[PDB]
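Appendix C. Worked example: agitoxin 2
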Amino acid sequence: GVPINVSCTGSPQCIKPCKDAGMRFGKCMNRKCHCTPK
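Step 2, the predicted output written as structure tokens:
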């Protein structure tokens, strides 16, 4: 959806950074967060 620059180890890392910016979910690809916009 909207790519945010947040370095991941797995998918649970992006849930709080996506919510605090202004989005619903945080699904992380290989080392990089991808938020689902609200």
